[PDB]
Amino acid sequence: YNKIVSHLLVAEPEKIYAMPDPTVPDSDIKALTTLCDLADRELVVIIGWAKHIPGFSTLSLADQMSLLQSAWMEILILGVVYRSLSFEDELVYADDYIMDEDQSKLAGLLDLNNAILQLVKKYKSMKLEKEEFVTLKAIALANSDSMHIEDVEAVQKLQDVLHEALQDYEAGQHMEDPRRAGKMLMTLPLLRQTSTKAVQHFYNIKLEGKVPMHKLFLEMLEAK
Amino acid sequence: YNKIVSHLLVAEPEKIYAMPDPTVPDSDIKALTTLCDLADRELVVIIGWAKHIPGFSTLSLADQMSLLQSAWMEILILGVVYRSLSFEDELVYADDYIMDEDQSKLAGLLDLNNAILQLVKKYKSMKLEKEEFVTLKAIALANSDSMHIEDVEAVQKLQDVLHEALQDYEAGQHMEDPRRAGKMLMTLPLLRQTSTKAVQHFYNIKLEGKVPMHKLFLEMLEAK
Ligand SMILES: CC(C)c1ccc(O)cc1
Ligand SMILES: CC(C)c1ccc(O)cc1
């Protein structure tokens, strides 16, 4: 099938472990510290992953950073969603960090994780494929609606290149549903809504100062 | 062209006047009171408008209310956006209520109205048509991602019926861009983001208790 889709598949990062500290008593602070540490390490590999997207590295460094600063949490959440598709009412943040309802309550994340489970529910019914997941991650990056873009036309071109890949993939692989590509695009509003909820929640955790956060995570959290 | 699109065009409500009180001194409270009063009256006609959407009135009353309670601010904002397309850095809330940057600052709405102007900017470059505007309003209603839906499959069917209308319209009217329907769908994340910003802002105005609000507006603002 589509070459961009195949390329994004081989660019997919390896799995990352959460490694919650086994000497630390379980608590909301422990769970939040674990999740923010995991996100920081995922962000490093997301930056390297974006360089494989056709045309992304030819944008200015400022535009690359603007797209990443608007899309980072959407990309993180799409990953948790995809890893959770074969599970029931549980979120696979990592193979060693699967959160059920009790753990979400203990971490103060019941509302956020329920929103992520709503994304999981919809993608389960659509039978989301890995090919579609990686293409939607790239589209979410290109379509992230930063207020600070310098080269608006180049970013629109990147959007068009990735949208074309999704449409070509669906036309060849899903002839039984001529509207499947658009159904995939119609899942992006809930992803944007859930990501905004997560950014706001963890910005407030940052303000309270009880959960340590690393530099790259803090950089994304403090972006305008 | 497409019959659903033609039907939505003839169902389009008449213009509504803001009628700011000419005896009241200008202030943030006056501007916010005017906008919330306008929104309340627009909501009444939005409820009547939704009954013309094929299949909407056959949903349960609870599902109709769930969709409206999730989408109401998206529908309101799409209207302001469309009315503003021929203007520059101004928002046409009504023919008698056009807000420029100074007025937005005075009302405490600079950040919200700048986000709405970002929607305007993108639709200007795409040359958004009235046919596309009314279809996107209906899609935003059907695709509003309420947590409380009873008949998930019927709501998905409504989404599919309206998505098909958009795709059929674009296939017939815009053969020069075979991806235009998907470009239209890719504007929905920013609409969802901007609507959430507006709901949160006016929920906080409600809490502060200095701006009177009418029953229907308050009902939507207080929905879960
Ligand atoms: C910041 C939290 C919500 C988070 C951490 C890792 C991840 O893959 C997705 C989300
Ligand atoms: C509630 C405010 C933001 C508002 C009022 C009327 C309208 O058409 C769109 C928005």
CA separation for the pair A155, B22 (Å, rounded): 46
Of the candidates A136, A52, A47, A123, the one whose C-alpha atom is nearest the C-alpha of residue B186 is: A136
Cβ contact, residue pair B185, A182, below 8 Å: yes
What tokens does B179 get? 């991806």
CA separation for the pair B129, B141 (Å, rounded): 19
| Contact indicator for B187, B119 with CB cutoff of 8 Å | yes
Pick the residue of A157, A179, A187, A199 with the most B CBs within 10 A to test the interface with B by mutation: A179
Q: What is the DSSP string of A128-185?
A: --HHHHHHHHHHHHHT---TT-S-HHHHHHHHHHHHHHHHHHHHHH-TT-TTHHHHHH
List for chain A the helix, strand, coil content (%; round to 5): 65, 5, 30
Which of A125, A147, A167 shows the shortest C-beta gap to B118?
A147
CA separation for the pair B163, A98 (Å, rounded): 36
CA separation for the pair B19, B105 (Å, rounded): 20
CA separation for the pair A93, A115 (Å, rounded): 14
A115 contacts: CB under 8 Å, gap ≥ 6: A193, A194, A197
Cα-only R_g, chain A: 17
Alpha-carbon dihedral A51, A52, A53, A58, rounded to 10 degrees:
50
| Contact indicator for A67, A146 with CB cutoff of 8 Å | yes
B220 contacts: CB under 8 Å, gap ≥ 6: B43, B68, B69, B72, B73
CATH number reported for the structural domain that contains residue A102 in this entry: 1.10.565.10
Rounded to 5°, the CA angle B24-B220-B28 comes to: 25
Number of domains in chain B: 1
Beta bridge partners of A98: A92
Q: Which atom of ligand 2 is nearest to the CA of B80?
A: 8
What tokens does A207 get? 């303000």
- Phi-psi category of residue A90: left, alpha or beta, with phi > 0 → left and psi -120 to 50 → alpha: beta
Task: Residue B199: give the domain boundaries.
Answer: 1-224
Which of B143, B160, B186 shows the shortest C-beta gap to A163?
B186
CA separation for the pair A213, B159 (Å, rounded): 41
What's at B76, amino acid-wise?
A: L
What tokens does A161 get? 């290149």
| Contact indicator for A109, A80 with CB cutoff of 8 Å | no
Cβ contact, residue pair B185, A190, below 8 Å: no
Structure letter (DSSP) for residue B87: S
Measured in angstroms, the resolution is 1.5
Rounded to 5°, the CA angle A19-A69-A221 comes to: 55
Q: Which atom of ligand 2 is nearest to the CA of B198?
A: 3
Structure letter (DSSP) for residue B13: P
| Contact indicator for B31, B106 with CB cutoff of 8 Å | yes
Backbone torsions φ then ψ of A93, nearest 5 degrees: -65, -35
Backbone torsions φ then ψ of B94, nearest 5 degrees: -155, 165
Q: Please give the span between the terminal C-alpha atoms of chain A, in angstroms, as a whole number.
A: 39
CA separation for the pair A196, A76 (Å, rounded): 12
Beta bridge partners of B97: B94
Taking only residues 133 to 172 of chain B, the set having a beta carbon closer than 8 angstroms to any beta carbon of chain A reads 139, 143, 145, 147, 152, 159-160, 163-164, 166-167
Q: HSE-up of B208 (CA within 13 Å, CB side)?
A: 10
CA separation for the pair A184, A163 (Å, rounded): 11
Cα-only R_g, chain B: 17
What Å distances lie between residue A218 and A37, A42, A205, A211, B33, CA to CA?
11, 13, 11, 11, 38
CA separation for the pair A145, B222 (Å, rounded): 28
CA separation for the pair B137, B5 (Å, rounded): 11
| Contact indicator for B166, B135 with CB cutoff of 8 Å | yes
Rounded to 5°, the CA angle A143-A147-A153 comes to: 55
Tell me how crowded residue A90 is: count the other CB atoms within 10 A of its CB: 17
- Phi-psi category of residue B99: left, alpha or beta, with phi > 0 → left and psi -120 to 50 → alpha: beta
Backbone torsions φ then ψ of A55, nearest 5 degrees: 90, -15
| Contact indicator for A142, A67 with CB cutoff of 8 Å | yes
Taking contacts as CB-CB distances below 8 angstroms, the residues of chain B near A166 are 182
| Contact indicator for B124, B169 with CB cutoff of 8 Å | no
What tokens does B95 get? 């023919």
CA separation for the pair B4, B165 (Å, rounded): 6
Which of A114, A185, A191 shows the shortest C-beta gap to B186?
A185
Of the candidates A98, A97, A174, A96, the one whose C-alpha atom is nearest the C-alpha of residue A135 is: A174
Helices (H), B28-187: 28-50, 61-83, 101-107, 110-126, 130-142, 152-173, 180-185
CA-based nearest distance A32→chain B, Å? 25
Q: What is the DSSP string of A54-89?
A: TTGGGS-HHHHHHHHHHHHHHHHHHHHHHHTTTSSS
